[PDB]
Write a protein that binds this DNA or RNA. Structure first.
Ligand SMILES: Cc1cc2nc3c(=O)[nH]c(=O)nc-3n(C[C@H](O)[C@H](O)[C@H](O)COP(=O)(O)OP(=O)(O)OC[C@H]3O[C@@H](n4cnc5c(N)ncnc54)[C@H](O)[C@@H]3O)c2cc1C
Length: 501
DNA sequence: ACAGCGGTTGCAGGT
DNA sequence: TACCTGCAACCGCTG
């Protein structure tokens, strides 16, 4: 009796998962030939390629738990195999007699190399491999192809291309498995019958002191529930313009579906379709680039360009990337990293980020601009690695692309527009409630200088119960000097990059 | 050929 | 209010 395997890596969902649905329609088509083994490989070869904070482990733990619950409703379960895909796949091809493997494709360099090996090792043992493209609405490979073998490097050019492509159908949830007993215990399940069960928090999070409030639980269920809440107000959705959403509202002012889209708990395609249904009922609506569909198209865009370039997360060797002489400065990196910059707005954001693992897009803008071209002149690659650790939604392509944007290394080139770490947040939080929350030491300062504590006299600071240099740090740089100064470094860097290009 | 246009989300100082 | 402006002038795309 041969086994059918779906491999979860992303696409952590039952709904709109063609790679998964094939296995289930295939098993039900000829029941009694097949066992079904939906697996997720807990890969230690991931921790040596990337950084993973506690908040995101909890998210993964919860997603895997929810994914297991849902598979059980389909008379199956999730099998969590510990091991590196190299050691794991040849063993399970053998002991399970794998007739077919399926998975959702990924453009990310680690997974491309991982996939090739498995694609090859599957052909070595005659296993059929059927991959699907469902993490994105459009296939980056086809987007590139229709643009004559090149990735379009502007948003509008990108839209023109994808409008010429038809959208795959959004699949529902797969068929409940019929007349299908549980698979026989392999060599590993015989030693330990719980070997492939869901990791507990204790097992997965080796670091529980670094967890913050569980504001965004993982899993398909919470993803679907949150989308429905996010789209309940159809007038809000129609008129949605990203630039008018607050970075410092205590409640998130956007959908916060990014972590769900990153793990594939929510299908980008389903989400796109729910929006398109709202568009019909609400013909007066925002367009790209600022609308919600437009935000999905940004995801698509960055995935396309990234797909074409394996050095996309890196300045050197990156076809898109401006070559800029960033400084090494450990003290300033360390201060930015732990929200100890002395600019309360920046510090507020980095602390929310660390504690909760999500921050608003424009909050990311503010801190990224500050780290790179705005103030500290530190490479975007560093900011990337921090975000990569702290973000629930860390996504290789998205993190890289947006970091290159904010440093004006690629895609964005108007480096004379520099965010003010003092001024930016005032429009949406003039009282500084956001700062009072994440920088509690300053929570008794008057609004007139909570963004600029260094304007308080010493006696003022004492009366506010927080002296600068002791209870909260002196600002590590003077924005009003360094941003003009950096603008001229950028002018200089661009001149050099032209004189090659 | 290269001036001119648009570019998801700047700031300060303006009506 | 939501769109003036000037800043010193960037990119890729277009015709
Ligand atoms: C320096 C920097 C790093 C970033 N790193 C990541 C990352 O690691 N992973 C990630 O998902 N987002 C990243 N973002 C992009 C963006 O900030 C988030 O996708 C967004 O804040 C998610 O919140 P939301 O779900 O409420 O987005 P919404 O405003 O509700 O938009 C809906 C969805 O569209 C997509 N989207 C929105 N904005 C962008 C964007 N600018 N680029 C690409 N896709 C977008 C997201 O999937 C998002 O969930 C980064 C932005 C910057 C400034």
């Amino acid at each position: 009796r041969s086994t059918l395997v779906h491999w979860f890596r992303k696409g952590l969902r039952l709904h709109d998962n063609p790679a998964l649905s094939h296995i289930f329609t295939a098993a039900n088509a000829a029941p009694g030939r097949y066992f079904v083994r939906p697996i997720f490989i807990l890969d230690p070869g991931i921790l040596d390629w990337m950084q993973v904070g506690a908040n995101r482990w909890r998210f993964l733990q919860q997603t895997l738990e929810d994914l297991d619950n849902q598979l059980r409703k389909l008379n199956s379960r999730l099998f969590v195999v510990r091991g590196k895909p190299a050691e794991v796949f040849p063993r399970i091809f053998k002991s399970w007699r794998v007739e077919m493997l399926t998975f959702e494709t990924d453009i990310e360099p680690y997974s491309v190399t991982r996939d090739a090996a498995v694609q090859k090792l599957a052909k070595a043992e005659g296993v059929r491999v059927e991959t699907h493209c469902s993490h994105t609405i459009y296939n980056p490979e086809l987007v590139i192809a229709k643009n004559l073998g090149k990735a379009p490097i502007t948003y509008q050019k990108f839209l023109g291309i994808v409008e010429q492509l038809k959208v795959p159908k959004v699949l529902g949830v797969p068929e409940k498995l019929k007349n299908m007993p549980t698979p026989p215990k392999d060599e590993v399940e015989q030693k330990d019958s719980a070997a492939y069960d869901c990791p507990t928090m204790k097992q997965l999070v080796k670091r529980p002191e670094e967890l913050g409030p569980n504001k965004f639980p993982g899993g398909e269920t919470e993803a679907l529930r949150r989308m429905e809440e996010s789209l309940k107000d159809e007038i809000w959705v129609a008129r949605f313009e990203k630039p008018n959403t607050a970075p410092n509202s205590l409640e998130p002012s956007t959908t916060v579906l990014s972590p769900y889209l990153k793990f594939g708990c929510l299908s980008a395609r389903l989400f796109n379709q729910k929006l398109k249904e709202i568009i019909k009922r609400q013909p007066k609506h925002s367009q790209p680039p600022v609308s919600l569909i437009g935000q999905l198209m940004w995801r698509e865009f960055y995935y396309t360009v990234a797909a074409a370039e394996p050095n996309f997360d890196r300045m050197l060797g990156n076809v898109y990337c401006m070559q800029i002489p960033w400084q090494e400065h450990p003290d300033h990196l360390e201060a930015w990293t732990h929200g100890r910059t002395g600019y309360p707005f920046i510090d507020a954001i980095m602390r929310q980020l660390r504690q909760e693992g999500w921050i608003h897009h424009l909050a990311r803008h503010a801190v990224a601009c500050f780290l790179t071209r705005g103030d500290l002149w530190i490479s975007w690659e560093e900011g990337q690695r921090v975000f990569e650790q702290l973000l629930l939604d860390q996504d290789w392509a998205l993190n890289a692309g947006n970091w290159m944007w904010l440093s004006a290394s690629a895609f964005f080139h108007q480096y004379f527009r520099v965010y003010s770490p003092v001024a930016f947040g005032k429009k949406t939080d003039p009282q500084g409630h956001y700062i009072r929350k994440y920088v509690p030491e300053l929570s008794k300062y008057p609004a007139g200088c909570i963004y600029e504590p260094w304007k308080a006299s010493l006696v003022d600071q004492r009366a506010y119960g927080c002296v600068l240099g002791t209870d909260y740090p002196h600002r590590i740089v003077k924005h009003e000097v360094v941003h003009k100064e950096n603008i001229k470094r950028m002018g200089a860097a661009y001149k050099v990059n032209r004189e090659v290009r």
